[PDB]
Amino acid sequence: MATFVELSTKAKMPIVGLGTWKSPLGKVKEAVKVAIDAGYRHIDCAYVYQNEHEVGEAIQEKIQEKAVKREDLFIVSKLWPTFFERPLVRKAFEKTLKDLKLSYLDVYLIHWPQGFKSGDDLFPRDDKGNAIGGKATFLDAWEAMEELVDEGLVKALGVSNFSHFQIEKLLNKPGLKYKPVTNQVECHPYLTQEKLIQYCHSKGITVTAYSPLGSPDRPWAKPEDPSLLEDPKIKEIAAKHKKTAAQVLIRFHIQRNVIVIPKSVTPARIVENIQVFDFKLSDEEMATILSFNRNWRACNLLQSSHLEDYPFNAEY
Ligand SMILES: NC(=O)c1ccc[n+]([C@@H]2O[C@H](COP(=O)([O-])OP(=O)(O)OC[C@H]3O[C@@H](n4cnc5c(N)ncnc54)[C@H](OP(=O)(O)O)[C@@H]3O)[C@@H](O)[C@H]2O)c1
Numbered sequence: 596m597a598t599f600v601e602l603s604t605k606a607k608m609p610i611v612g613l614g615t616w617k618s619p620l621g622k623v624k625e626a627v628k629v630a631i632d633a634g635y636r637h638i639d640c641a642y643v644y645q646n647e648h649e650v651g652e653a654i655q656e657k658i659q660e661k662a663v664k665r666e667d668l669f670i671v672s673k674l675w676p677t678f679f680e681r682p683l684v685r686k687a688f689e690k691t692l693k694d695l696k697l698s699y700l701d702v703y704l705i706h707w708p709q710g711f712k713s714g715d716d717l718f719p720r721d722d723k724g725n726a727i728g729g730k731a732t733f734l735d736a737w738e739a740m741e742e743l744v745d746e747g748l749v750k751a752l753g754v755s756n757f758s759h760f761q762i763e764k765l766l767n768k769p770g771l772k773y774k775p776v777t778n779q780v781e782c783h784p785y786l787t788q789e790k791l792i793q794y795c796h797s798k799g800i801t802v803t804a805y806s807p808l809g810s811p812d813r814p815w816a817k818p819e820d821p822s823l824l825e826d827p828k829i830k831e832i833a834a835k836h837k838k839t840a841a842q843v844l845i846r847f848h849i850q851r852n853v854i855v856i857p858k859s860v861t862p863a864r865i866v867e868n869i870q871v872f873d874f875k876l877s878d879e880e881m882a883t884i885l886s887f888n889r890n891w892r893a894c895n896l897l898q899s900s901h902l903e904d905y906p907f908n909a910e911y
């Protein structure tokens with residue numbers, strides 16, 4: 596049962612959530628049920644994961660058995676960048692909310708800052724695999740998303756994969772109604788995000804750490820790629836506390852007041868991953884872990900490098 600990070604809306608965002616990317620149909624429902632049982636309240640979802648309907652089924656069950664009040668649940672989903680044109684924001688969201696069988700989302704995030712070709716082809720690409728841009732921007736999207744908050748369909752808005760330059764563009768937009776309550780970005784010992792975290796915090800924006808375990812099952816994973824869970828320098832620290840590497844990797848974010856959403860459909864791991872409130876990494880250990888930084892991203896979306904608002908070119 597987790598602590599919280601307070602958002603600028605005074606809302607309380609549970610500091611550990613369950614990730615659902617690539618959680619297969621036929622296992623994600625069980626994963627959500629096991630998670631809620633184990634004390635998880637934060638569930639990270641997305642339209643593009645195309646499993647929200649099963650997530651929704653699992654949440655409905657736990658609600659009616661009263662394992663949890665809806666108000667105790669913190670549900671996040673995200674707008675995919677092929678839906679930045681205004682009517683598409685509404686339709687994408689409605690499909691998300693319908694699949695989820697909920698009456699409101701706690702947070703709705705812009706999934707990526709760069710607009711893709713609009714429509715229902717989620718991965719518009721040229722023969723070489725490069726992403727196809729669209730003309731609607733994350734500003735056009737945000738505008739429409741703000742209406743969701745007005746109508747109470749969404750409690751708060753956020754962004755994901757944004758650089759500080761992007762955040763600035765958002766905050767300095769004349770006629771902005773709502774500010775982002777979080778920036779969800781890849782974060783872990785190899786990509787510690789010190790400057791971006793500093794920047795978001797100085798603006799009232801929390802950070803949500805995705806792929807905290809290095810996303811070891813991602814599709815594009817090459818054996819030469821570094822591997823956090825197998826890192827002897829991470830494993831040493833874990834051994835020092837008789838905890839697993841995953842638990843250290845998750846705890847690291849908690850002690851930075853950074854929200855963290857490890858993905859699993861394995862019951863034992865789902866439990867393990869929230870058992871991170873009965874130990875504490877020393878300052879020496881936190882400093883050692885931070886020193887592992889090498890600015891390596893497991894998620895680069897390099898196929899969209901050529902589009903205007905590519906977030907990862909900037910330093911932070
Ligand atoms: N905003 C974005 O652009 C974006 C991008 C990526 C991810 N995300 C979100 O962040 C979540 C987490 O990131 P991620 O899914 O990329 O990867 P991750 O959480 O770093 O790692 C997930 C992988 O680690 C395994 N795992 C989980 N717990 C473990 C443990 N205790 N011991 C050993 N292995 C363990 C899982 O296997 P099993 O599942 O088979 O147990 C899964 O293969 C996603 O599910 C998604 O909700 C967002």
Ligand SMILES: O=C(O)COc1cc(Cl)ccc1C(=O)NCc1ccc(Br)cc1
Pocket residue numbers: 616617641643644645717718719720725726727896898
């Ligand atoms: O958002 C995430 O959790 C991880 O990102 C993805 C998730 C899914 Cl289910 C599918 C694709 C991605 C992703 O970002 N893929 C790389 C990509 C994206 C767009 C194009 Br066009 C080409 C490759």
